[PDB]
Structure formats: structure tokens, C-alpha cells
Amino acid sequence: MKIYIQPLSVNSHTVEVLANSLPKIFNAEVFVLPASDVSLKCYNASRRQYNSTCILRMLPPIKVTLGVTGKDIYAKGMNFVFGEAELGGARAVLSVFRLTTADSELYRERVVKEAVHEIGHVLGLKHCSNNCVMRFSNSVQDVDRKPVSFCRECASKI
Ligand SMILES: [Zn+2]
Ligand SMILES: [Zn+2]
């Protein structure tokens, strides 16, 4: 498995977190693509948020490609989303905007959890109700309560 991280208006240090954490989690070769600013095509001026579905479309369809942004994102019908993924496809996007917090270590932990969650969807995993990183999180309090690891059921399916 190969994972391509596409920085899209994001702190380079946060990208490094993912480059350093994801290989072991996915037993994958990880590539960091050249940084770019997230496309203004995907900016909703009324909401001052970027549409995640728009961002996904602009990523290369190379499994697995994860776009990562510091901008707040939303998808249709949602006030915000942490991310959006093609289930069993090639592409996902993560926003770290809603994860911001004072404790650097907690921020880091949230970033890894939510990246792993998105990539799990690309690998074909639906939301999981177990003690699992694939749980849906309504808020960052939910993110903090779920683990970074896949449950035994989800791990068996990758
Ligand atoms: Zn999800
Ligand atoms: Zn699970």
C-alpha cells in the first residue's frame, strides 16, 4: 500500500506528523506531495468554508491519496465535517481546523486519529460502533474518546 499526502493550506509540521505516524499504522510507503494552497474553486464565500467534495474531485485518483488542510471544511447538509472519503475508492480529505487545541500533544493525537479514520474509509471501512478509530465522531470530545487503533474486526478487513 502507498499513501500520498497532499498538503492543501496546512502547517508543514502537521504533515510531518502524518509522514512519521502513518507508515507503521498501515504498513505503507508514505509520500509527501508538493504543498499547494487549497483551491478557491472550492471556497464557499457565504460560509467561509471549503467544500470537501469539491476538494476530493481535484485530488489525483491514486490509491491512497489524502489531502490535508488547515481550512474548515463542510459537505452538503453538514455544518462542518472532519473529512470526506471515497469508500473503497482512492481519495480522502482531512481538515485539522476543528481539532485545534492548546495542548500540542492532544492536537497531534487528534490529527493522527482523524487521518487514520479517513484512510480507513478509503480502504473500504464503514463507520464502526466498536472501541475503534472508525467510530463516527460528532465532536472533538468524541474524537478524544475513541482510540487511534482499528478494532480487531476492522483490522481483519484491511
Ligand atoms: Zn467517517
Ligand atoms: Zn472497528
Residue numbers in the entry: 1 to 158
The authors write:
Archaemetzincins are metalloproteases occurring in archaea and some mammalia. They are distinct from all the other metzincins by their extended active site consensus sequence HEXXHXXGXXHCX4CXMX17CXXC featuring four conserved cysteine residues. The overall structure of AfAmzA resembles those of other metzincins, consisting of an upper N-terminal domain (NTD) and a lower helical C-terminal domain (CTD) with respect to the active site helix α2, which harbors two of the three zinc-binding histidines (H117EIGH121) and the catalytic base Glu118.
Consequently, two different crystal forms are observed, one triclinic and one hexagonal. In the nat-AfAmzA::malonate complex the catalytic zinc ion is coordinated in a tetrahedral geometry by the three histidine side-chains as well as by one carboxylate oxygen atom (O7) of malonate, with ligand-metal distances of 2.0–2.1 Å. The catalytic water molecule is displaced by the malonate O7 atom and is moved towards the catalytic base Glu118. While both nat-AfAmzA structures with carboxylic acids bound in the active-site cleft superpose quite well despite different crystal lattices, the structural superimposition of nat-AfAmzA::malonate with NHis-AfAmzA shows that substantial changes take place in the bulge edge segment and the S1′-wall forming segments, effecting main-chain and side-chains of the corresponding residues. This is opening up the substrate-binding groove in order to provide space for a ligand. The side-chains of the conserved Phe80 and Phe82 residues move slightly while the side chain of Met78 adopts another conformation. In the S1′-wall forming segment the side chain of Phe136 performs a χ1 rotation of 115° and interacts with the malonate carboxylate group with its Cδ1 just 3.3 Å away from the malonate oxygen atom. The side chain of Asn138 follows this movement by occupying another rotamer while its main chain Cα moves by 2.1 Å.
